[PDB]
């Protein structure tokens, strides 16, 4: 009896563990994909060098 249980449940849990692994992976490449599209946003877009001097000069100020 215990063996039947363990084995079935084991087959079931496999699907979850798998499903879980897929999600994780994908959402790795997904949030990581963010990186390479934002390193493309600043390196490119010369209009993302203006939004540079911007937010940053708002540093000196506040602190003081």
């Amino acid at each position: 009896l215990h063996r039947v249980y363990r084995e079935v449940k084991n087959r079931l849990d496999y699907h979850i563990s798998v499903q879980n692994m897929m999600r994780q992976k994908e959402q790795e490449h997904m949030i990581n994909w963010v990186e390479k599209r934002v390193v493309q946003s600043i390196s490119a877009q010369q209009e993302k060098e203006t939004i540079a001097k911007c937010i940053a000069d708002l540093k000196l100020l506040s602190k003081k």
Partner: protein, 110 residues
């Protein structure tokens, strides 16, 4: 002139340009150059005896009594944050060439 070091001034004066402090950031930057030529300064701008956040305080004395304070009261700590007060004179030079590109990079309609 190179780029990375020259970008430091352009990445600090960039905000300055929007205001027009190039005079307060270009004239000030000139100070950092004379400070490095000062033998007595070399024993303070590069003294590992002070600290990482201590020497930064003493800087204010050379930032509020030299010319700095506005567009140089940030680049001062940055210039002495990692220890780039050895070849900084090269960064000031780039400012003279970058400070001239800001005049043309403006809506000249008037």
């Amino acid at each position: 002139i190179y780029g990375i070091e020259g970008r430091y001034a352009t990445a600090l004066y960039s905000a300055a340009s929007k205001q027009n402090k190039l005079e307060q950031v270009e004239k000030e930057l000139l100070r950092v150059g004379q400070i490095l030529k000062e033998p007595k300064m070399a024993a303070s701008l590069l003294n590992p005896y002070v600290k990482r956040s201590v020497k930064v305080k003493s800087l204010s004395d050379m930032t509020a009594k030299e010319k700095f304070s506005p567009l140089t009261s940030n680049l001062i700590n940055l210039l002495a944050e990692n220890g780039r007060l050895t070849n900084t004179p090269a960064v000031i030079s780039a400012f003279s060439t970058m400070m001239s590109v800001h005049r043309g990079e403006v809506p000249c309609t008037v």
